[PDB]
Amino acid sequence: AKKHLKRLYAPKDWMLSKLTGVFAPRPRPGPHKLRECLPLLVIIRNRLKYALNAREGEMILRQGLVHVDNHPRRDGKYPAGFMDVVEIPKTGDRFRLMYDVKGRFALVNLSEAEAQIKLMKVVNLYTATGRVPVAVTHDGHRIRYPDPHTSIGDTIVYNVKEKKCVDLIKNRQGKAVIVTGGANRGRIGEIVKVECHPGAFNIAHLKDASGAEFATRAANIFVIGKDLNNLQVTVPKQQGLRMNVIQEREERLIAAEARK
Amino acid sequence: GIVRSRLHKRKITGGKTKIHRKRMKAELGRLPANTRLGARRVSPVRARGGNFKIRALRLDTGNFAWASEAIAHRVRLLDVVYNATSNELVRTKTLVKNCIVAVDAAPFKRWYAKHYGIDLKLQREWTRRRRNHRVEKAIADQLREGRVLARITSRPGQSGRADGILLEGAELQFYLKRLE
Amino acid sequence: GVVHSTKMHRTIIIRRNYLHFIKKYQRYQKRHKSLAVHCSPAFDPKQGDEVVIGQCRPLSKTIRYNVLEVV
RNA sequence: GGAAGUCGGCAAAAUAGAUGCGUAAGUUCGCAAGAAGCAUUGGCUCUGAGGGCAA
RNA sequence: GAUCUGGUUGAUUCUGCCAGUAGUCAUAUGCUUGUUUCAAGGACUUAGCCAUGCAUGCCUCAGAAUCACUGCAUGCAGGAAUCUGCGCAUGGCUCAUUACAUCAGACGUAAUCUGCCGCAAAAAUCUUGCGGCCGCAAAAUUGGAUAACUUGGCGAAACGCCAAGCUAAUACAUGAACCAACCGGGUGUCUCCACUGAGACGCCCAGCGAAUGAAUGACAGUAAAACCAAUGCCUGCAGUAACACCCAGCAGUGUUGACUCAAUUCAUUCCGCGAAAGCCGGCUUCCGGCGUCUUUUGACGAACAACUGCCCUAUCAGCUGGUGAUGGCCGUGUAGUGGACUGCCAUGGCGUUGACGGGAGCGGGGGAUUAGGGUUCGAUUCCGGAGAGGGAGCCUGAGAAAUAGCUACCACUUCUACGGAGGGCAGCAGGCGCGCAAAUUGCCCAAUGUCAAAACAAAACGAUGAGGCAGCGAAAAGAAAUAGAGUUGUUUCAAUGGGGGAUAUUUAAACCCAUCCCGAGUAACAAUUGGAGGACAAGUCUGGUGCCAGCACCCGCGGUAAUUCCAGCUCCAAAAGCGUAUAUUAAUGCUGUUGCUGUUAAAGGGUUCGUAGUUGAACUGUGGGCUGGCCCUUGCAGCCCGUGAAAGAAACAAGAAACACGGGAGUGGUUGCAUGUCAUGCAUGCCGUCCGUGAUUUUUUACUGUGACUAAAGAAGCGUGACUAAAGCAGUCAUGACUUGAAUUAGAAAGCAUGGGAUAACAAAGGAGCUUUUUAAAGGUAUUGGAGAUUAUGGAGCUGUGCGACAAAUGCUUUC
Ligand SMILES: [Mg+2]
Ligand SMILES: [Mg+2]
Ligand SMILES: [Mg+2]
Ligand SMILES: [Mg+2]
Ligand SMILES: [Mg+2]
Ligand SMILES: [Mg+2]
Ligand SMILES: [Mg+2]
Ligand SMILES: [Mg+2]
Ligand SMILES: [Mg+2]
Ligand SMILES: [Mg+2]
Ligand SMILES: [Mg+2]
Ligand SMILES: [Mg+2]
Known about the structure:
Protein name (chain A): 40S ribosomal protein S4
Oligomer: part of a larger assembly
Shape of chain A: globular
Helix content of chain A: 10-25%
Domain KOW (chain A): 174-195
Keywords (chain A): Ribonucleoprotein, Ribosomal protein, RNA-binding, rRNA-binding
Bound molecules: magnesium ion
Pfam family, one (chain A): 40S_S4_C
Number of helices of chain C: 0
GO molecular function, one term (chain A): RNA binding
Strand order of the largest sheet of chain A: 15-14-13-12-16-17
């Protein structure tokens, strides 16, 4: 019955300093996993600087001023995660939670039209009472009548304002994906082939836009479009292209010299 | 109290395990029901998670199925006749899963007459039903005698019920010879 | 593994032999392990034969594997 | 109460059958050994094991 | 920096130890200490004993106020107190137990349970009012009891108690017809057909969840045709999802590597399931926030299992054993698997690759030292485990074998009016003992978190010894004062801190730092600790003592001329520090895998036989031809890539070839005219592969190259003028931008995918248990409209006859 979280044990992506407190906020159970989420207090106090401390974070959150997936959330320990839509109407800000090329959490600005939909990955399919097929999603959603072509690897385009599915994208050989876990998290690539090893982890081989090869486990890929040029979601600035470490350092040095 | 852990057992090498922790509630056991034949009496038991187990102390009625006809009936239990663990359980008349009992055969006779028109309206569906259908002589002999053998299929100490199925086929002959 | 003993009823003992590396003396030493495996009447293994086994739920105090194929 | 009696535990008391478990020093390896010691046992109603010769 | 020196001889060259030397967030003690930053701190011995105080509670607009409570004029509130709901199983402390236990990396639960949080689901139920069981109607206006309180109190007291009287609910109990559907099973009276079939009608019974029984939970080895009875469609077999009307397409199609799983229908049986019979708000209605029962899946957890690894000891060699030891069968118990446990059966399981027993130890991340290989430490911040004086037992609860919960015994112990009643600091401060050995009975919830009936504010401030702040503190680590510049043969010049104060700044409030002024000439604002024969830097100095006193880590000094003792002077080393003791790393190739010795220095067994173990000979194997007289460098391309033999046949390819699957491929991959119209038919058409299933036959392990999967803190290091640095992850520049940054790496072994075949390992064998193809004949499932039966004809294999063609790694026109 754990209800605390030491700061040294908290995920590195939250970017909390080791010298400014013994504890970190422990996320509650919810739509996303504890190790793969970002609590609302961290979003509002760190990252965005609307709150200077936890006292001001509680004032903002308990008034219902922050909407996640078109619903007010009043808990600072609420776990927010991949592809969630966060809107603060009083300020007039809209973001989506994504992974940048370095694997860190990134907030991508959205237009009003783009804020109405989110991509949902199927993780299970079962039959409910009365012979009703149900699809379970990577964020804990349960869809009561999915498209008859839905499979466990597919992606569903979901309108959150009307609570209705609009489109289905299948996991095939010629589709574009983004990596959600492992050493390649945040990279955008194209499927080349999938290796099936029954009873163990399937392995996917992918190709980057620059021709670089990399592989991950099949449970870490997320379909986002029919090819590398027609993506159904907006991605961060770097477009999921890993850059050479030697080259990246050289450009940063040159930019510093010119800026000064 | 009673425990179900492996700490007190010997190792396969014959050595002794040195225990360095106290007993935990998550590994308990409880005393057996020892269900007997008699007027109904049960006792509820609060198990892990808040759910309730029904511990039956005495039972005399149950729900018994005729598998060939895919039907069932509620009948009175008369005796315990055989038990594979030991015959001291037959002497005390203890009810457990997979023991052989004798039940009342009157409700099954009534269903046969009303479904096939056979004693052991214009629309005669009976002629259709008797077509390509036959009954075993071993069963019909008991149905006329009044009592018929059956096998308990439920666990009375876990659910509080004594349900079962009638013996047919080669399993009936197996237990008839063991009783002879 | 290889079959070591077949004296019990519907259960056998198998042996797995392997080499273990010692870093300080850059050399190996022989080691082995023993397991109890349930054998179904579909197979008739003999001492010295090689089998393929698969993990299952606990079936006794020591048995955690089942024979799947005899070579 | 328990050898204070008496030269001296003389005399008396005391132990006790059968079955299971268990058993020291010493030793010519045979013993010491029933070492010492612990436990069970009635009556009644039942259940199992241990055979023969006739096809 | 991959380093050595003194001591055995009258001299020499060795072996070998003793002594010297440098580190330690590594402890303790001695002498000393001006400034500032950063920090460990009753672990070692006694998981010893504890006075006193404090450490866990929670109320919004939104569950219950008639305080005989408080203001102000009927509405408020600190609304006291109580009932109700949630929490108190987390955090904090400690390391006593412990070696197939725990733990690390990697995995399983298809063997299970799971409050709070997320997304969802819901059609069972005869109730109420009036009138006389019936009839008429519908916004169902449901019932009883208990606290706080009042009265009488008992008791020396007790986080001790009794009786009576009042009264709330989101406490407890009861309970809702018609509105209101689809679908099915069993059975009686009416119409019709035929001589059975169809349709009414009645009559039952059909919700979620649980139990037992019966079906479904697909197919994916052959094709043409007759004959019966019942049916469909045409006027005899074309055309054809299925189905006797209201519905002419209202499921012929769940998931997985795999399921007795998901879900559905039938029979019988439970005997847990409110629309809180709830609370607020905005506008007569309408709308919106909460709150709660049951069902089902994610998430957060719990419990179980074990693939590889995990100290010393043989003056510990056998251990276990139906008395549960290893396994089997039917049961019981559990949330669930299981000798976990009852009954019966069989005789197994483990061990020199070290079982069993004994001893010292909580396990990791990691620390010290080190050219490399190594040696050693890890009570202690993060993760895992275990405990609350000892030992058992248990209730509540989603979760405890809970201890600032209960029950008992043992050892200690407190109060008493003697009747009785209490206690558990290995939480924070403190105290006693123990010791070589370790702080204040301080301030605060401002920050970081946790709980919760809860934003903040307004009459109107939740708790928190977790946590933070300061006091003590030469454990350890950074930066740094004790002066500087000059003129003549002892006299001047500026400068600044320590310190003392500030309009002030910092801070929850204080303190420290930072900023700024009245202040140095024995700048008395006065530096120490060890040494001066050698190792080892530095005195033939001057007195005293006289093998005494004493020094001396070792070698050695001292017996009246002491380079060594006690002193003065002068010098040396490190310096706000420097000695001593005990452990430990290097020095140490004096533990030797890299890397030691064994004739005489310590050490080859008296000689052989022999089992585990270690080690073990050669061989299957130059590819070739053409471009820029053999051979070799290069760059080219293309080869059946020895030899045969031109779609097949040689060689390969289980990663491959044979079979079949429309429920295989986003619709069956690639190379306005017709069909239907009762139509939401609003429909339909204009050679290589993919996927499932069957048949056929075979190669690992190991090493090596990549790749995947792998908590921080710590180590390495990319950037950055916190004034530098030890640090930290920040910050930089002109109603904001940098679409700011916070890169990257290594981490044993075991586990996962793949490609490469040289050196090797495992297993098998022990060489006499060792033909193909093409036609003729004899014998013995699928298509016929669909569904159920009987029937020939054929496919194919089983075989015994003839015939054609081609091979053969060993001559049949042959041998005997
Ligand atoms: Mg006596
Ligand atoms: Mg006497
Ligand atoms: Mg006398
Ligand atoms: Mg006598
Ligand atoms: Mg005796
Ligand atoms: Mg309460
Ligand atoms: Mg079983
Ligand atoms: Mg160690
Ligand atoms: Mg004791
Ligand atoms: Mg204390
Ligand atoms: Mg001197
Ligand atoms: Mg002198």
